[PDB]
Write a protein that binds this ligand. Structure first.
Ligand code: AKG
Ligand code: FE2
Ligand code: FE2
Length: 366
């Protein structure tokens, strides 16, 4: 058995020659990446932006070190660290990790991918891509008067040593993500969320041998995408991926929900419940925001309707998806676990009704 994360597993991973990510990803300029563009062409595949020009992405120069991160963040903060060889979660202090990171003789391969710092002094040193902020649900529909706290999943600092490996997974809540390498290099293994691939992934996740079975071998194509320094990668909803730190690296990233692929976002969330993924603890109120969005998307439609216009395809599909989800969460035999997530500004029974007819119309009036 070849265990994920081990020196042996890495020998095989580094030797396989996967189909190039160039077969599917789109490379564009920071200026080309607009909400307008996405709403027409769709956001169904990874988008690569080689130069950060025009992304609105601001961050410390290529010399920003791991030592600086400890200063700006505070070596005291306890962080989640990954023992890659054992594919297990550990704990440490930003101080001890840096000490480990800088020692030339690393006795083990440890990785940091969950350090959220928007609540620290290192936050001012970073501004996320404008596109991410334009699409982000939290950026557009989160009321300043809710009881639920606003989620901080927009700024992560990643620091991994050579050969750190994150096994295949789908980002929490089915969120999209942006990724930038300050220095070093990351290698992404990307799998398209085809119905076949999603079923198989959920199967592989709920099987004991998951760690001895390379998921890349269970699908038709596993695209190798090399993210070199200065590059920014945008991974869309539901994409299954694994990442390998080919060399000591520091990168930044963030997660965001949007109106383009609501169907896939709802499918990935429901799957993550079925597998009881500890990751979902990062978007505790995914359902709360879904109600907020439904109210807004209902409005947009009510308008286009009362003025004789037909909505864009993705918007009907998306709203129709929210409809099923909201209705499922209200079932008498289930509402007891979803209830607390219903905002006090929304009338559950009523909203699901307004959605029902608005969808009824569009479907019939077409
Ligand atoms: O860097 C890693 O090892 C994993 C990163 C990742 O999965 C992400 O940004 O969505
Ligand atoms: Fe991920
Ligand atoms: Fe968001």
């Amino acid at each position: 058995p070849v265990q994920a994360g081990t020196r042996t597993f890495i020998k095989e991973l580094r030797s396989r020659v996967f189909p190039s990510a160039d077969e599917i990803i789109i490379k564009m300029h920071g200026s080309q990446l607009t909400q307008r563009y996405l709403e027409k062409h769709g956001f169904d595949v990874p988008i690569m932006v080689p130069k950060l020009d025009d992304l609105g992405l601001r961050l410390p120069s290529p010399t920003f070190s791991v030592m600086d991160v400890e200063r700006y963040v505070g070596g005291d903060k306890v962080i989640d660290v990954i023992d890659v060889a054992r594919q297990a979660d550990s704990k440490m202090t930003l101080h001890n990790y840096v000490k480990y990171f800088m020692n030339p003789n690393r006795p083990k391969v440890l990785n940091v991918i969950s350090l959220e710092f928007s609540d620290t002094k290192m936050s001012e040193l970073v501004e996320v891509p404008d596109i991410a902020k334009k699409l982000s649900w939290v950026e557009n529909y989160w009321p300043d008067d809710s009881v639920f706290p606003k989620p901080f999943v927009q700024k992560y600092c990643l620091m991994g040593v050579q050969d750190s490996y994150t096994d295949f997974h789908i980002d929490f809540g089915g969120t999209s993500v942006w990724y930038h390498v300050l220095w070093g290099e990351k290698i992404f293994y990307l799998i398209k969320p085809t119905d076949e691939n999603l079923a198989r992934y959920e199967s592989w996740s709920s099987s004991v041998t998951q760690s001895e079975v390379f998921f890349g071998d269970k699908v038709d194509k596993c695209y190798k995408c090399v993210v070199k320094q200065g590059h920014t990668l945008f991974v869309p909803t539901g994409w299954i991926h694994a990442v390998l730190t080919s060399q000591d690296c520091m990168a930044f990233g963030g997660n965001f929900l949007h109106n383009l692929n609501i169907g896939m976002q709802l499918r990935c969330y429901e799957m993550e419940k079925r597998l009881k993924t500890p990751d979902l603890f990062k978007f505790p109120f995914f359902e709360a925001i879904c109600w907020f969005v439904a109210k807004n998307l209902l409005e947009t439609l009510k308008e286009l309707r009362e003025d004789g216009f037909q909505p864009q395809t993705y918007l009907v599909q998306g709203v129709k998806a929210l409809h099923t989800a909201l209705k499922l969460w209200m079932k008498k035999e289930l509402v007891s676990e979803h209830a607390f997530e219903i905002p006090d500004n929304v009338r559950p029974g009523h909203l699901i009704k307004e959605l029902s007819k608005v969808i009824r119309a569009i479907e019939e009036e077409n």
